[PDB]
From a paper:
RSV F is a class I fusion glycoprotein that is synthesized as an inactive precursor (F0) that is processed by furin-like proteases at two sites to generate three polypeptides: the N-terminal fragment (F2), a 27-amino-acid glycopeptide (pep27) and the C-terminal fragment (F1). RSV is sensitive to neutralization by antibodies directed against F. Neutralizing antibodies target six known antigenic sites: two of which (sites Ø and V) are considered pre-F-specific and four of which (sites I, II, III and IV) are available to various extents on both pre-F and post-F14. 5C4 was elicited in mice immunized with DNA and recombinant adenovirus expressing RSV F, and was identified by screening hybridomas for neutralizing activity (positive selection) and binding to recombinant post-F (negative selection), where each of these steps utilized F protein sequences derived exclusively from subtype A virus. We show that 5C4 potently neutralizes a panel of RSV subtype A strains, yet poorly neutralizes subtype B strains, whereas D25 potently neutralizes strains of both RSV subtypes.
To define the 5C4 epitope on RSV F, the crystal structures of 5C4 alone and in complex with RSV F were determined. Crystals of the 5C4 Fab diffracted X-rays to 1.5 Å resolution. The complex of 5C4–RSV F was solved by molecular replacement using the unbound 5C4 Fab structure and an unbound pre-F A2 structure (PDB ID 5C6920) as search models.
Residue numbers in the entry:
A (entry chain H): 1 to 52, 52A, 53 to 82, 82A, 82B, 82C, 83 to 97, 100C, ...
B (entry chain L): 1 to 27, 27A, 27B, 27C, 27D, 28 to 211
Write the structure that this text describes.
């Protein structure tokens, strides 16, 4: 097994450019072909192009000629995608991937980088703990209200509480994104054990923790 | 460009059944030796996962419930037996010709027995009220099928303005759905009313499930 680690989410003004990275561990990037793949929200997959890091050779879908520039750096074992003169249609998740060690399948994929093209500024979320109204199981919540752009990452107790969790996809409301999450535990678990919602929002460089506390 | 047409666009299959998905190419994707067709599974928020390469080879680490077949223009992905973890979108992709292209995907849903939602209501947090806001949240959790109706009543009047409804993707373990309904008011508007009700109407009963609180 190997790992492809992509750079973090980015908010880009229309007309500006951005450069994404894809750092490989466990193998030499010269021994494969790298690909970049675009996925617009709720849409399918679009192959942008590929590079052979052993010699830099590239091949693009003509649709992306001029828009996309793929490079690689063997010194840092990293592949790159530069997107130029961005417009709203460039808002997407971008993936890097490698070919089975260019005509075979893509067997390893990065985690994706969210790129949002917008004139709107970053807005950090307001994170609210949701305790039950003032049985054998109890359901707690976390409301992540009014942020821009996507994504956020939400965990419970820093990820150690993962069973019984429902994290609801973010949606636009009132010009910003709102997301929520519930966790259900046994009534002997809470409030006896502390349960905390942890929310990170890369664009605003914020990281907040909200402990769920019984109402009074 | 090679156009890959997948069928069906969506399907529901029960646990333990076999199913097949079709991928048809606009021109041949073959050499003398291989068909350059690959299949991927994708769940929302995750990258695609390779299942089958070169039409019929099972990717290392993938369960031997996935198999692929076909040549020339007509390709098939088989899942046998289907498990709950298979709820996902499936894509085919060709690499015989540049540009590489993908099909538009097949969304696989798991069919299971109907389940009523577990409903929980949450008044605005004290912190949100300090900020001058007020959202009322209702979770409708672990129900089936996905179709469900949520209504908000404030002091006996139904309200849809300001309601935000978000469904989870189908659960990879129990194949249920969950949904979050948030009624967002201003705080000055919230504390002028006292009765707040989330009502869940689902095919598992003609009478709605009602959760309420008094401010």
């Amino acid at each position: 097994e190997v790992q492809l680690q992509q750079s973090g989410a980015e908010l880009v003004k229309p007309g500006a450019s951005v450069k994404l990275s894809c750092t490989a561990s466990g193998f030499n990037i010269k021994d494969t072909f790298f690909h970049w793949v675009k996925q617009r929200p709720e849409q399918g997959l679009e192959w942008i192009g590929r590079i052979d890091p052993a010699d830099g050779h590239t091949k693009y879908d003509p649709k992306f000629q001029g828009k996309a520039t793929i490079t690689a750096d063997t010194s840092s074992n990293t592949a790159f995608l530069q997107l130029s003169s961005l417009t709203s249609v460039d808002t997407a998740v971008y993936y890097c991937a490698t070919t089975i060690t260019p005509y075979n399948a893509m067997d390893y994929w990065g985690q994706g980088t969210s790129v949002t093209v917008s004139s709107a500024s970053t807005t950090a979320p307001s994170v609210y703990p949701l305790a039950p109204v003032c049985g054998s199981s109890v359901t707690l919540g976390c409301l992540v209200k009014g942020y821009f752009p996507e994504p956020v990452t939400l965990t419970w107790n820093s990820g150690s509480l993962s069973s019984g969790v429902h994290t609801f996809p973010a949606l636009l409301q009132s010009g910003l994104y709102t997301l929520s999450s519930s966790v259900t535990v046994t009534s002997n678990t809470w409030p006896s054990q502390t349960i905390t919602c942890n929310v990170a929002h890369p664009a605003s460089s914020t990281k907040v923790d909200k402990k769920i506390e019984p109402r009074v | 460009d090679i156009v890959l047409t997948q069928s069906p666009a969506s399907l529901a299959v029960s646990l333990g059944q076999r199913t097949t998905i079709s991928c048809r190419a606009s021109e041949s994707v073959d050499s003398f030796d291989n068909s350059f067709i690959h299949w991927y599974q994708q769940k929302p928020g995750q990258p695609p996962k390779l299942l089958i390469f070169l039409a019929s080879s099972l990717e290392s680490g993938v369960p031997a419930r996935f198999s692929g077949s076909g040549s020339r223009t007509d390709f098939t992905l088989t899942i046998d037996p289907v498990e709950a973890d298979d709820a996902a979108t499936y894509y085919c992709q060709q690499s015989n010709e540049d540009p590489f292209t993908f099909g538009s995907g097949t969304k696989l849903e798991i069919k299971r027995a109907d389940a009523a939602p577990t409903v929980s209501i949450f008044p605005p947090s004290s912190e949100q009220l300090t900020s001058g806001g007020a959202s009322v949240v209702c979770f409708l959790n672990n129900f089936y099928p996905k179709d469900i109706n949520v209504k908000w009543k404030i002091d006996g009047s139904e309200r849809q303005n300001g309601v935000l409804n978000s469904w989870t993707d189908q659960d990879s373990k129990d194949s249920t759905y969950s949904m979050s309904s948030t009624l967002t008011l201003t705080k000055d508007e919230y504390e002028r009313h006292n009765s707040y009700t989330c009502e869940a109407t689902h095919k598992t009963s003609t009478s709605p499930i009602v959760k309420s609180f008094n401010r």
